[model samples]
Target: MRVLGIETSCDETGIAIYDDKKGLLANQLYSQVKLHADYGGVVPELASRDHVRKTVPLIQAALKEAGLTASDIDAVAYTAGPGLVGALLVGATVGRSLAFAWNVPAIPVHHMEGHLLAPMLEDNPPEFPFVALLVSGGHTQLISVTGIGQYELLGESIDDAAGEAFDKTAKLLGLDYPGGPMLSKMASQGTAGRFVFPRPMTDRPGLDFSFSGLKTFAANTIRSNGGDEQTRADIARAFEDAVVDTLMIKCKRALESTGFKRLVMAGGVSANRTLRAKLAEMMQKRRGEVFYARPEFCTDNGAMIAYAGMVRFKAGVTADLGVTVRPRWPLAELPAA
Candidate 1:
């Protein structure tokens, strides 16, 4: 089956075509980072408008990239929610309408589920019955997975997500908008052991995370110590270390508690070099494995959505003709296919 996937969850517009037998035929994306940069954060209204302008063009580009016409597509899959209502509506309406026009099935995909299944697109995919760390700008969740759609949310952030903390702390350091990556780059030049930040909630027993405290710690550090280049770098390193260590500690505990050796890390923050390296070391020490998609697939993209849609379509799962979107859909609520 050939599935056309549309992803307009937030600041990016992603479109791709996936063939069950041939794998992903084409993947296209347009990031609205520049559009939202001056605003310091995503403005939902601007995000929705950009999606309206980019979704259809990107879809057309994806089809051309795949060397196929609309008739060749067997289904249209769109992200149904857990994102901006207007952003979600753009894809839902476009996808649902295209499926109708093409006489194909429409698949409503969960945004987080797309992130979770992204690793399947890699050459070395992790098997089922594993633990997943879904770390991104919008979420920080540890999920127990036995199969597709069989997810048990083991733990999540009680306040700001890890990525949100990263960005907020970066802003506190006077970094530019979309500060997560900028903060990480500055951290690479930082002097280790100069400062040690606390690893929140790791001292406790639950798998839940609390990063807001860490962000506050960063703010306090910057306020107390002058923002000299070296000082800022040191603070960035300390903050990054604390967050990475906290995530590692929680993941280790989750692996022990669930007795699941395999761990799959997905989402934007999963692309972090420090986190990935530390997790790799931890998994290796425990005689287990860690899996992740390439950095390009780590962020919101159409390829993951397309791949997810193809999986569900194969399982005889597809949405009705009516258009609907869930801005607050929970992963745990998804039915098992």
Candidate 2:
């Protein structure tokens, strides 16, 4: 089966085609980073408008890249929720309309679920009944995956996600918008132990994470310490170390508790080099495995959505002709495939 996936859950417009036998055929993406750069953060209105402008063009580009027409597609899948309402509407409207026009099924895919399943695209994918750390700008969650659509929420961020904390802390350090990667870059030059940041909620915890307090700590540190280039780098290092440590602790706890050897880390934050290295090292110590998609697929992309849609479609999950989107859909609500 050939499934076309549309992802407009936020500032990126991602379109792709996935063939069940041939794997990913075409993955087209257009980021609104420059458009939202001046605003210091994503302006929902601007994001929605950009998706409107680029969604179709990228769709066309994807079809061309895949060397196929719309008629070749067996189903259309779209990111339906846990994102900006306007942005979600654009993808949902386009996906539902396209499926209807093509006489194919439309699948409403959960945004987080798409991220959770991203690792399946990797060459050595993690098997079922594993632990998934879905860390992104909007969400930080630990899930127990039994199979497709069989996700059990283990824990999540109670306040700001790890990526949000990283970006917010970077802003406090006077970095540019979308500062998570920039912060990590600065952290490379930082002096370890010069400024130690707290690992929030790790001292005593079940499995939930808390990063808002860590952001506040960084803010206070910046306020007291002068903003010299070196000082900023050191602070960034401390912040990154703390977050990586916290995530490691939680992931280890989850693995031990569940006795699951395989760990799949997906979403934007999983692209961080520090986090990936630490997680890999920890998994090795536990004699387990860690899986992740390529960096391009780590962030929002059409490939993950397309692959996720294909899985659900094969499992007989499809939406009616009605156009609907959930801005706050929960992952656990998904029915088992």
Candidate 3:
């Protein structure tokens, strides 16, 4: 089946076409970074409005790039939940309307599920029964995935997620909006051995994360010791290392604890080069395999949704004719299809 995927769960607008025979044909995205940058973060009202103006044209652009028309699309898939209500509705409503108009099936995809399944779109996909480290916007989780829709929540953040901690820490340093990536860039210039930060929750036995205290720690450290430019960079490095090392330890522990040989990394935070490198090294030592999507696919995108929807479509999954979206849906609620 040929599926058209739409993703407008937040500031980015994405559209793509996925084929059962050929994989992903074409994909397009429009980031609202500039629109949200001036405001220091995403404004749901603005994000929802932009999705209204951009999604249709973006879809057409993707279809044209693929050398196909909407008539060739057999199904429609969209990120339906676990995001801003307005943003989720924009994609869900439009996607549902298109599916109905085209006389094709509509599949409501969980945003995080799209992230987890993104690695499958790569040339070398991991098999079933893997541990997924999900470090996305506003959420962090370790999931035990056995098969399609068979997800078990291993552990998650009780407070701020890793990515959330990054952003919050950046703000504390008076960095720019969308600060996680910018902070990472600054950390690249930092003196590695000059600073050391705490690795939160690694002292415990469980995989549950607690990054809120780490954010507070960064704030306190900056207040006492991070005024100079070099000091700021050093602190950034310290914070990055703490987060990376903490995740490395936890991911390794999760593998050993669950006895899963495959580790699948996904979500926006999974794009962190430091974390990726450390995880790769860890995997080599463990004699296990690691999987991830290409950088572009790691972030919010339509390609992941299209591919995830394709999997479900193959299993005869379809949404009812109801206009719905879950801004706070549980990841493990999806039935095994």
Give the winner by lDDT: 1
Where does model 2 exceed 4 Å of error?
Answer: none
* lDDT values for all models: 0.93, 0.92, 0.91
What are the per-residue Cα lDDT tens digits for candidate 3 across 1-337? 7999999999999998999889999999999989998898899999999999999999989999999987899999999988999999999999999999999999998999999999999998999999999998788999899999899998999998888799989998788777998898888988996878888889879999888888888888899884888899999999999999998888988898889999999999899989899998889888999999898998899999999888888888888899789999899998896
The C-alpha local distance difference test score for the whole of candidate 1 amounts to 0.93
Please say which candidate is ahead in lDDT: 1 or 3: 1
Alpha-carbon TM-score of each model against the true structure: 0.98, 0.98, 0.98
What order do candidates take by lDDT, descending? 1, 2, 3
RMSD values, in order shown: 0.9, 1.0, 1.1
Scored against the true structure, residue 247 in model 3 reaches a CA lDDT of 88
Q: Which of 1 and 2 is ahead in lDDT? A: 1
- In angstroms, the error of model 2 at 334 is 0.3
User: Model 3 Cα displacement at 323 (Å)?
Assistant: 1.4
